[PDB]
Write a protein that binds this ligand. Structure first.
Ligand SMILES: CCCCCCCC/C=C\CCCCCCCC(=O)OC[C@H](COP(=O)(O)OCCN)OC(=O)CCCCCCC/C=C\CCCCCCCC
Ligand SMILES: *[C@@H]1O[C@H](CO)[C@@H](O)[C@H](O)[C@H]1NC(C)=O
Ligand SMILES: *[C@@H]1O[C@H](CO)[C@@H](O)[C@H](O)[C@H]1NC(C)=O
Lengths: 65, 85, 245, 434
């Protein structure tokens, strides 16, 4: 048995074809982000849009080279 | 002139085929039988020991006939199999 | 072409004419727009058609007005389609939509309370940044030493990626001190005051960390720097193309 | 170049029907002759863009069914109309012109879901573009459910008046000549699949021994409708067809070829083999592609069949060895548009053409030879026409070939095989006796 909550979403690929009986499935690589973000961040931004809010948090990151 | 060719087209008679395509397999088999019932005599003649001139004569005289019959069976069979002419 | 957002309450447009007139003298056709008076929104896209080629977001004070006018998910899609952007900020003006958009790019501005200050300064009254802090030659290269005037600026942290283009820096001594007991946003030379960004499609954003940089009352000290930064921002100073490979 | 002003349009009403995947313009004009020597000419003006793609241009009097000698010429461009009888210096005569373009409006949103309806955008000229001074003019659009404009003009006079089934325009009392300063752009609803055949080549194999004429066609089909956003997803497709939503969707699922009267031995083939989803009923061949052709997808396939030859040939009257053949020029899906047509007729091994006539002006005609099964010398005689712009159901003509086929070359076909068999036997003889 398979439940719809099992399979996680696919963030780096996007489906472009699948046969009548779902036998052969053809996916395509997504083009890398224009702004330089990791596509997982784009995914989490598009699936979690309204509730994912944080007031203020100083980001922790390495000193700019 | 398109008008006069189109006038001549309808006026004329239709096309009557030489040998209908429904009775060509019959001729195909009845010619396939004959074209081998004769071409075996050719090989028997050439194999048989006799005068060279007589062998040549009794080979070509009944080889031309087998040639014609095979060249007329290979059209009826080709039409009957679905690859016309 | 260019669109010009502003807010009369926070900062009147009458103190920015000198530069916008300089734009009107270079064939730019810019339509002014208010933030509250116009209840009807503005349309950047109609059926996948970019209307404007440039955007200038003068200081605002957050609110639901800006958030209605241009949300993040629309501004990203506009900037991605070769749309240049200029953007300003200050500890008196930190729009939430601007902050979230810049955070999505990689630039992190300061929050409302935090303000930069430097005790080692020739003029105590306001911030004077020396022309030795220029970090990128193609944007602006100082022919002669000068002093850019800033007032109540707000430095920004930068991530480590290949698109961000630091243009100015803050003096090493300076530091951001907030009213409350919050940790200093940026300490030392790690805090940048003017920061560009170049998309992979050759779109260009420029964030200026002070509302007092472009005011017409300051045009004797930082005239040429502003007139070159506004050229670089609108893709008309350093553009390269390869003809035959 | 401007034609000598000689006529005056005393009425000019034009109607454009956008209902069948190609613009079909119909202009009804009453015309008066300027007082001068009786002239017999007329120059209709097409824009240089539209004139590049026009596939049919007819013109006839309202009173008389018969047509005129309408012809195209060879930056406004012109088409020539010429009257049978010279018009009087001062006379009034009605006339009707029908043109069939090959350009349809581009999808406006361009990205629609597979269940939404698509809207198309078309750019034409509002004020009539004529080579003479026009007195009264009216414009009308028909054939769609809903019309809307796009960047409407401020002036009220230049604004369309909506109607229940049509979109008319107010008559203009005085229009000067060569006025093309207003580029109207209009969007309209349209749910057809917008087929387009980028390349068609159809072969017609005559054969007198078997007395059968067999057709073989190779379609390269492209859908021009709005592409689908978010990419393909079989789940949505197979969940929407189970509900009654397959009314007029804009993707191709089944094509309906219309063959001649009695066809046999139908086949439908693809580049990667045989397609099994075909169905041949009476006078209709239904075809299901491998995948549904959404917007922007290409499908290249082949379809063939066979007919009795007695319906297309006719032996002449004076002699029994002069034949006249009337080959149909197009029979495909109901409403497509062909961007190139290559019509090849393969007359038998020893034919010899005497006359060639076509009812639609072709671009190129040539004669070669091509060898086929049991063609042991010079093969068949191939006669190929090349047409450029053709419509599916209004470019209905018949190419008339007139050739001869003497019995001295009808019976050479068995003899040319008898020669090989006899040579092989006479070679085996020498090889075995030496
Ligand atoms: C050897 C004796 C048995 C031979 C069996 C052959 C019968 C089946 C052959 C057949 O099905 O033909 C298929 C195929 C059809 O050709 P098309 O590409 O469709 O022609 C285009 C015209 N529109 O024909 C061929 O490929 C070659 C067949 C020719 C051989 C026929 C010779 C018959 C015996 C002499
Ligand atoms: C709204 O805009 C007007 C523009 O003149 C300004 O004067 C006013 O202060 C603004 N009100 C706000 C931002 O609440
Ligand atoms: C017409 O077809 C012939 C035959 O191949 C070719 O030689 C000639 O160049 C063609 N002309 C045009 C204008 O297409």
């Amino acid at each position: 048995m398979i439940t719809p909550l099992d399979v996680p979403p696919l963030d780096y690929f996007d489906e472009v074809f699948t046969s009548e009986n779902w036998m052969v499935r053809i996916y395509q690589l997504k083009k890398d982000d224009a702004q330089g973000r990791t596509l997982r961040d784009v995914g989490e931004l598009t699936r979690s849009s309204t509730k994912t809010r944080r007031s203020i948090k100083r980001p922790e990151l390495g000193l700019r080279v | 002139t398109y008008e006069q060719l189109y006038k001549e087209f309808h006026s004329s008679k239709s096309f009557q085929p030489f040998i209908h395509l429904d009775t060509q397999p019959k001729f195909a088999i009845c010619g396939l039988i004959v074209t081998l019932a004769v071409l075996s005599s050719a090989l028997f003649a050439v194999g048989s020991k006799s005068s060279y001139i007589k062998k040549l004569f009794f080979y070509t005289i009944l080889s031309v006939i087998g040639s014609l019959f095979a060249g007329l069976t290979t059209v009826f069979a080709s039409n009957s199999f679905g690859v016309y002419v | 072409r260019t669109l010009v957002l502003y807010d009369q309450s926070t900062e009147p447009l009458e103190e920015y004419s000198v530069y916008l007139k300089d734009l009107e003298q270079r064939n730019y056709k810019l339509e002014y727009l208010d933030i509250n008076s116009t209840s009807t929104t503005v349309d950047l896209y109609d059926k996948e058609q970019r209307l404007f080629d440039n955007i200038i977001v003068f200081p605002t004070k957050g609110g639901k007005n800006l958030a209605r006018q241009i949300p993040v998910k629309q501004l990203i899609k506009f900037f991605e389609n070769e749309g240049n952007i200029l953007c300003m900020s200050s500890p008196g003006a930190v729009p939430n939509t601007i902050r979230l958009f810049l955070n999505e790019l990689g630039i992190y501005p300061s929050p409302k309370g935090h303000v930069i200050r430097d005790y080692f300064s020739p003029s105590s009254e306001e911030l004077v940044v020396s022309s030795n802090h220029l970090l990128n030659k193609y944007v602006y290269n100082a022919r002669k030493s000068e002093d850019f005037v800033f007032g109540e600026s707000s430095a920004a942290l930068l991530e480590n990626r290949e698109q961000i283009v630091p243009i100015l820096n803050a003096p090493r001594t300076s530091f951001t001190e907030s009213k409350g007991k919050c940790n200093s946003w940026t300490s030392g030379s790690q805090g940048f005051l003017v920061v560009g960004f170049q998309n992979l499609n050759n779109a260009r954003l420029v964030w200026i960390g002070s509302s007092d940089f472009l005011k017409n009352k300051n045009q004797d000290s930082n005239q040429e720097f502003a007139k070159e930064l506004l050229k670089w921002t609108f893709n008309e100073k350093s553009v390269i193309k390869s003809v035959h490979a | 170049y401007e034609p000598p002003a000689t006529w005056e349009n005393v009425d000019y009403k034009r109607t454009i029907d956008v209902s069948n995947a190609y613009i079909s313009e119909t202009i009804e004009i009453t015309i008066k002759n300027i007082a001068s020597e009786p002239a017999t000419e007329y120059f209709t003006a097409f824009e240089s863009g539209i004139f590049s793609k026009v596939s049919f241009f007819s013109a006839y009097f309202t009173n008389e069914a018969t047509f005129l000698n309408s012809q195209l010429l060879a930056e406004i461009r012109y088409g020539i109309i010429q009257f049978p009888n010279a018009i009087s210096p001062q006379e009034e005569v009605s006339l009707v012109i029908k043109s069939f373009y090959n350009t349809v409006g581009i999808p406006y949103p361009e990205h629609v879901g597979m269940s939404e309806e698509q809207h198309l955008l078309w750019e034409t000229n509002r004020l009539p573009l004529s080579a003479y001074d026009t007195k009264k003019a009216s414009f009308t659009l028909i054939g769609s459910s809903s019309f809307e404009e796009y960047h409407p003009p401020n002036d009220e006079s230049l604004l369309g008046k909506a109607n229940g089934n049509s979109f008319e325009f107010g008559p203009w009392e005085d229009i000067p000549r060569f006025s093309s300063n207003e580029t109207l752009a209009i969007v309209y609803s349209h749910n057809a699949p917008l087929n387009q055949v980028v390349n068609l080549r159809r072969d017609i194999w005559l054969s007198h021994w078997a007395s059968t004429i067999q057709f073989e066609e190779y379609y390269e089909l492209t859908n021009k409708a709005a592409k689908l956003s978010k990419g393909f997803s079989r789940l949505e497709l197979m969940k929407q067809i189970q509900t009654q939503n397959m009314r007029q969707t804009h993707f191709v699922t089944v094509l309906d070829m219309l063959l001649p009267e009695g066809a046999t031995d139908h086949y439908f083939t693809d580049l990667v083999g045989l397609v099994s989803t075909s169905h041949a009923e009476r006078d209709h061949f239904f075809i299901r592609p491998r995948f549904p052709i959404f917007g922007g997808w290409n499908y290249n396939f082949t379809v063939g069949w066979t007919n009795k030859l007695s319906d297309f040939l006719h032996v002449s009257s004076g002699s029994d060895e002069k034949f006249v053949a009337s080959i149909p020029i197009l029979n495909g899906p109901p409403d497509t548009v062909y961007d190139n047509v290559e019509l090849s007729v393969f007359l038998p091994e020893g034919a010899e053409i005497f006359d060639i006539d076509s009812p639609v002006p072709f671009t190129n005609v040539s004669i070669e030879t091509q060898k086929s099964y049991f063609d042991l010398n010079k093969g068949h005689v191939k006669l190929t026409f090349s047409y450029r712009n053709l419509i599916s159901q209004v470019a209905n003509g018949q190419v008339l070939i007139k050739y001869d086929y003497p019995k001295s070359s009808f019976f050479k076909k068995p003899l040319s095989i008898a020669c090989y068999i006899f040579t092989a036997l006479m070679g085996v003889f020498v090889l075995k006796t030496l």
